[PDB]
Symmetry: D2
Subunit: 179 residues, 4 copies
């Protein structure tokens, strides 16, 4: 039951968002999630973040693993949010120019972890080292793949992909979309 650690709200309409942590459209949608929840109310929607790792974002596997490591800390899903926020705020610094070059060609995973730790104020290296943690990475990927998710972000409402929803929408459109 990894299907559960990145949920907010408890209401019967289910909004699922597939996010790539270093993707600029993903980040835009990410930063609108608070408002969505605040508008719709926790008694009416459950909002779930699903991690969509993109192979052409070469540190995604590391970054994704951090987010999920953070989720095992005491802050749980909030520590995970902290990490996503730290990365989202400093997006370019966790990606590669044209998905090919730039300073990160010379950054190590341990660098990327340290850098997340700085920005988030969280201690990740020990949690990251936990071997059970691969199963959370696998769950997200397997779930994304079963649902045919490619583009980040992708929005599902009650289990159906909603091609018309965009990270550019006003929160108020998401609110009527969710219905």
């Amino acid at each position: 039951m990894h299907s559960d650690a990145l949920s907010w709200g408890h209401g019967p309409r289910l909004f699922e968002v597939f996010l790539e942590p270093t993707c600029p459209f993903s980040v835009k949608a990410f930063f609108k999630l608070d408002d969505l929840l605040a508008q719709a109310g926790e008694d009416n929607v459950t909002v779930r973040i699903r991690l969509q790792s993109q192979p052409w974002h070469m540190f995604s596997g590391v970054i994704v693993r951090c987010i999920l490591a953070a989720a095992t800390l005491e802050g749980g899903k909030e520590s995970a949010k902290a990490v996503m926020t730290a990365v989202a705020s400093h997006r370019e610094e966790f990606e590669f120019e044209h998905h090919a070059g730039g300073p990160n060609l010379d950054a190590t995973p341990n660098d990327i972890i340290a850098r997340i730790e700085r920005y988030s104020g969280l201690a990740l290296a020990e949690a990251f080292a936990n071997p059970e943690l691969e199963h959370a990475v696998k769950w997200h990927t397997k779930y994304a793949r079963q649902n045919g998710i490619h583009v980040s972000p992708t929005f599902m409402i009650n289990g159906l992909v909603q091609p018309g929803m965009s990270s550019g929408d006003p929160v108020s459109k998401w609110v009527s979309d969710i219905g």
Copy 2:
């Protein structure tokens, strides 16, 4: 055409295999593709490799990009095959203990590229930097996702996934399975 770079044989039965370059089971299946073609016959089958980048294999994105970078050199698919072979032979050195730890925590994308260059004897860095190369990476991923590939390896015969086929199989079983 991204859809047929990594392609061998010219027969009418299409055999597609999804491989993660640093996955032990993938490597096992990879080293059987020569026999497969020999035993099935180039007049009967076409064998194509698709790259299944697994996010829990943290250097997969770098490595997959290298493979597709090699396919752009003069030797095409043979140079890509050279790169897959070099990674496959030294699989452990391009992965992480329990997909979490070990020396690769302290390696950089550039370390990994240099390493594949050594072992394959190919010059890749320049080709790796070509910004058009993200599209090849996207094509494999997109095709994999549309077909719902998750487990590596997975085998397709004429566009249908074959959940019974396995990397442990004797090649002679693949030959009858293909038909």
Copy 3:
């Protein structure tokens, strides 16, 4: 909400089963869902039926529409369940010898509807004619397709397909599989 008409129990582990109403294996699994809920516990699981219409079951579209028509009557899911039970009990009479022949070659959609009405003791024709009902049929099909369901039945636990689970399984195996 199409996504939860055919739903029982209120537990947090979600058990989804894709059923073709005239499929022998589906029928077998269908008649085990009462035990499943009893043994797993309504406090632990939610069981949902999704309708997997198989095109080689030639009256499936008529029959699936009837089921979803029943769900619109006052008895809701219980009336839909009544219709599934009536079809299930007389499965052979709503199918075709070798999916090709037999008496149903000479039956009409109206014959099939009357037949289900007899056996379930429900009045369906009027509800069947409601033009809004195509959307329920579309919803199941769309959801099935997005998840890549093909074989009937197929089982999902918390949104992941479970290829190991089977209609032959003892219900006690389902209970441990669910967890």
Copy 4:
């Protein structure tokens, strides 16, 4: 190898179209296929029809089975085309008003077969009766489902779904799309 019976051309770009025989958009695309082939040339494209049976088209299973029965006759893929053309020309007559009512509520499969036979000039009942024929129906469905096909028509080029292509396009757009 059912993957093969509805192909025209032999060129290296592969245009796959998923069609529902009684779907009006499907029919529109269907009638443009000749021109597409004539423009692009049989040495440059292979054009493949994939049958997308829609459960809310209540005689689709029957009609689809006919098409595939026709493919086993001596005319092979042309006899199959004849059937698709006979149905396409008389579309409404093989469907239901609002996918719910109309005269067809009182039509039997044997009626639908006879009606196809009239319009196509072909003898189908014996071919239809063949039990092997279920495997062709299964192949199309399984292939559609693995690829996540819902909407009819859906267009793939070299194995990727092309969301931007429409049955409303000019043939000349398809030609540059296929590239």
